[PDB]
Design a protein around this ligand. Structure first.
Ligand SMILES: Cn1ncc(Cl)c1C(=O)N1CCCCC1
Ligand SMILES: *[C@@H]1O[C@H](CO)[C@@H](O)[C@H](O)[C@H]1NC(C)=O
Length: 342
């Protein structure tokens, strides 16, 4: 079980001003630290955020959080469930800022809500240094869905933070699960993120911001545009036919010719964006399943599971015979890979 700690700096807050926090399970025989960002969409104006506060309040407030949580998938401490990193120090950071982990704005006389996701990550890191992270060899910042996009937006800032605080030996790496999206044509989002950024005082990686410049920061929320600007090593996990991508594309699965062509073109475009991503795992599945599910071990690409691919990635950061790290399906239709989640 992971144990809740509310941030000691209580001015770093969830949307409603309650303190943010993290769940921690220490493994004192390990110098590996896994910090996982929860997902859960976002909100981008007063009326939309008010609705979320009524029926998704745990994603906006710590007032009702439980004292403990169970680690599952890559956050499990059991070797059978987590062949990759079962002995690591485990951290789960709840998503309570509704800003895709980009915000740096407090409540005030003019702001009904606080959007502090980027500051929440930095404060968790800072408070963990006094609890053993100062002795780490590797800090893996991971996340799923909006948390996977959050990894892409924040991994280099964590690296910079540790360097400036005097910890140059900790190697910061990223694992982005189901956060790699395309700004493609719909079958029947960039506007909502554009408004969200202004509402949140959202911040993006500086090298990406310098490319796209003022007012165009929304580009940096798209993996294929922000990834080439990052310096930390980042492993990308993305279904070729991700259900959230298809939802924003207004696709809801007898498929006729126009829809068949649309779905096949989407898979090919996703494949193309991963061609120059050397550490990646992209199965040809229609899914919303994420890496904290207990059966995450079951899916294979070309005969290699994701826990194995991640272990090969570890070895590469010390090509390897029998230990691949670039695993992208080439078949063109959902479930043409037999190991897809049922
Ligand atoms: C937050 N999120 N989770 C799943 C999906 Cl899809 C989204 C999403 O729509 N966006 C806007 C465009 C790209 C990045 C964030
Ligand atoms: C608490 O966090 C806020 C926001 O990041 C910061 O302005 C303030 O200096 C912090 N306080 C302390 C004591 O570190």
């Amino acid at each position: 079980d992971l144990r809740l700690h509310l941030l000691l700096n209580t001015s770093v807050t969830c949307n409603d001003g309650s303190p943010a926090g993290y769940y921690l399970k220490e493994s004192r025989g390990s110098r590996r630290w896994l910090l996982f960002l929860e997902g859960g969409w976002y909100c981008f104006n007063r009326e939309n955020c008010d609705s979320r506060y009524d029926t998704m309040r745990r994603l906006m407030s710590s007032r009702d959080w439980p004292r403990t949580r169970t680690g599952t998938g890559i956050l499990s401490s059991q070797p059978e469930e987590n062949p990759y990193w079962w002995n690591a120090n485990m951290v789960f950071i709840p998503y309570c800022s509704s800003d895709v982990w980009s915000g740096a704005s407090s409540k005030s006389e003019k702001n009904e809500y606080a959007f502090m996701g980027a500051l929440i990550i930095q404060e968790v890191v800072r408070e963990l240094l006094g609890r053993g992270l100062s002795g780490a060899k590797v800090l893996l910042l991971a996340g799923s869905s909006a948390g996977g996009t959050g990894v892409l937006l924040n991994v280099d800032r964590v690296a910079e933070q540790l360097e400036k605080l005097g910890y140059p030996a900790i190697q910061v790496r990223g694992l982005a699960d189901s956060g790699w999206f395309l700004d493609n044509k719909q079958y029947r989002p960039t506007e909502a993120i554009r408004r969200g950024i202004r509402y949140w005082n959202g911040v993006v990686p500086e090298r990406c911001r310098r490319q796209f410049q003022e007012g165009e920061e929304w580009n940096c929320f798209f993996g294929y545009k922000v990834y080439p600007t990052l310096r930390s090593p980042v492993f990308v996990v993305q279904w070729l036919f991700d259900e959230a991508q298809l939802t924003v594309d207004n696709v809801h699965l007898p498929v006729q010719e126009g829809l068949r062509l649309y779905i096949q073109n989407l898979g090919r475009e996703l494949r193309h964006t991963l061609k120059d991503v050397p550490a990646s795992f992209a199965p040809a599945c229609l899914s919303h399943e994420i890496i904290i599910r207990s059966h995450w071990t079951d899916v294979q690409v070309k005969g290699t599971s994701l826990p194995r691919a991640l272990h090969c990635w570890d070895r590469s950061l010390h090509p390897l015979k029998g230990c691949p790290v670039h695993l992208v399906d080439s078949c063109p239709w959902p479930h043409c890979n037999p190991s897809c989640p049922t």
